[PDB]
Amino acid sequence: CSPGIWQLDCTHLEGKVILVAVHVASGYIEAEVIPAETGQETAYFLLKLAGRWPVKTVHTDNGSNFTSTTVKAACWWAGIKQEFGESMNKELKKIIGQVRDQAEHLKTAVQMAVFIHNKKRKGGGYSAGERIVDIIATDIQ
Amino acid sequence: CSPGIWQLDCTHLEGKVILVAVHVASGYIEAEVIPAETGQETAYFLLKLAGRWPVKTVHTDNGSNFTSTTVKAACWWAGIKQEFGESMNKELKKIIGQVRDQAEHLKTAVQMAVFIHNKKRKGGGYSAGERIVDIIATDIQ
Numbered sequence: 001c002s003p004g005i006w007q008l009d010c011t012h013l014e015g016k017v018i019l020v021a022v023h024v025a026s027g028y029i030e031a032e033v034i035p036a037e038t039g040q041e042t043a044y045f046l047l048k049l050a051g052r053w054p055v056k057t058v059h060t061d062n063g064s065n066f067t068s069t070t071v072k073a074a075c076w077w078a079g080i081k082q083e084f085g086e087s088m089n090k091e092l093k094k095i096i097g098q099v100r101d102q103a104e105h106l107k108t109a110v111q112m113a114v115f116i117h118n119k120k121r122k123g124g125g126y127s128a129g130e131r132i133v134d135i136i137a138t139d140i141q
Numbered sequence: 142c143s144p145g146i147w148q149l150d151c152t153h154l155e156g157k158v159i160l161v162a163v164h165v166a167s168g169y170i171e172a173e174v175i176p177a178e179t180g181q182e183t184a185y186f187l188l189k190l191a192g193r194w195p196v197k198t199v200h201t202d203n204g205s206n207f208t209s210t211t212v213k214a215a216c217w218w219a220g221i222k223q224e225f226g227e228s229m230n231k232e233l234k235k236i237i238g239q240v241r242d243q244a245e246h247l248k249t250a251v252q253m254a255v256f257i258h259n260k261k262r263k264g265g266g267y268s269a270g271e272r273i274v275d276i277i278a279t280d281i282q
């Protein structure tokens with residue numbers, strides 16, 4: 001599938017909000033514990049994302065997430081469009097579960113789990129980390 | 142130069158602290174406005190970094206930055222080593238200066254400037270964004 005498609009959603013765990021972005025074509029993840037599930041947090045996260053990867057369109061499973069003028073301003077500025085028409089959210093949460101006692105804060109456990117997931121070779125042998133980079137460079141060259 | 146070398150430092154602007162990571166070989170940047178210049182912030186940032194890129198060693202211009210047990214725990218966990226033996230900090234700040242009135246918060250202006258810098262083609266024609274991805278994939282293949 002297309003190299004500029006991302007999925008963005010918020011799970012909850014321990015009374016906190018985890019924003020999770022998946023690079024659809026590769027399965028690569030960025031996630032962030034956010035204080036509140038708001039347009040401002042989402043806008044900000046999108047700007048961070050877009051400055052790091054070529055982000056053409058973003059899908060979500062909660063469309064209402066994308067209605068705030070704040071979010072609209074961020075996709076306007078970065079040049080992003082919504083997607084209208086895995087779950088890595090289960091798996092990520094499987095991994096957080098495993099590493100939870102290795103860290104005091106949920107946020108640290110999240111980043112441990114992002115790390116584990118992104119490196120883990122899918123022997124059949126690339127990792128998600130290796131695939132996104134290969135796909136985006138592939139698509140340069 | 143080696144594809145797993147990163148530089149990490151904190152500039153100040155408007156009474157706030159900006160953590161800036163540079164991928165040395167490419168000139169690609171990740172930056173983040175942090176509330177305080179502490180070991181905890183640095184540790185956390187390093188975990189985020191390492192889960193996204195293959196991070197072998199990290200250089201800094203303030204070695205004392207890396208002495209806290211907190212920071213040590215993060216490079217231990219992610220498998221990172223210090224570097225002992227551009228400035229993109231001028232340039233980044235040039236760009237923040239330019240975009241400042243486009244955003245209410247310093248943090249947004251930072252992310253705008255990271256975006257601008259990472260995409261900007263160095264016509265001679267790749268961007269920093271294109272080079273890191275090419276270098277890391279290059280180094281896979």
Ligand SMILES: Cc1nc(-c2nc3cc(Cl)ccc3[nH]2)c(C)c(-c2ccccc2)c1[C@H](OC(C)(C)C)C(=O)O
Pocket residue numbers: 102103104105106108109180181182184185210211214215218
């Ligand atoms: C709060 C916190 N405190 C300490 C910690 N620092 C210490 C310093 C001393 Cl002197 C003794 C015990 C100590 N424990 C550590 C070592 C970590 C840490 C855990 C795993 C990997 C890297 C660092 C965290 C961590 O939070 C971040 C720093 C990443 C924000 C967490 O959520 O567990």
Ligand SMILES: Cc1nc(-c2nc3cc(Cl)ccc3[nH]2)c(C)c(-c2ccccc2)c1[C@H](OC(C)(C)C)C(=O)O
Pocket residue numbers: 039040041043044069070073074077243244245246247249250
């Ligand atoms: C605080 C804030 N508020 C609003 C904003 N939202 C609005 C909603 C309405 Cl209804 C009217 C005016 C509005 N202005 C916007 C549109 C932005 C924004 C600026 C540039 C690109 C994307 C979003 C920010 C922004 O901060 C983040 C959201 C990115 C954390 C900033 O620092 O300027």
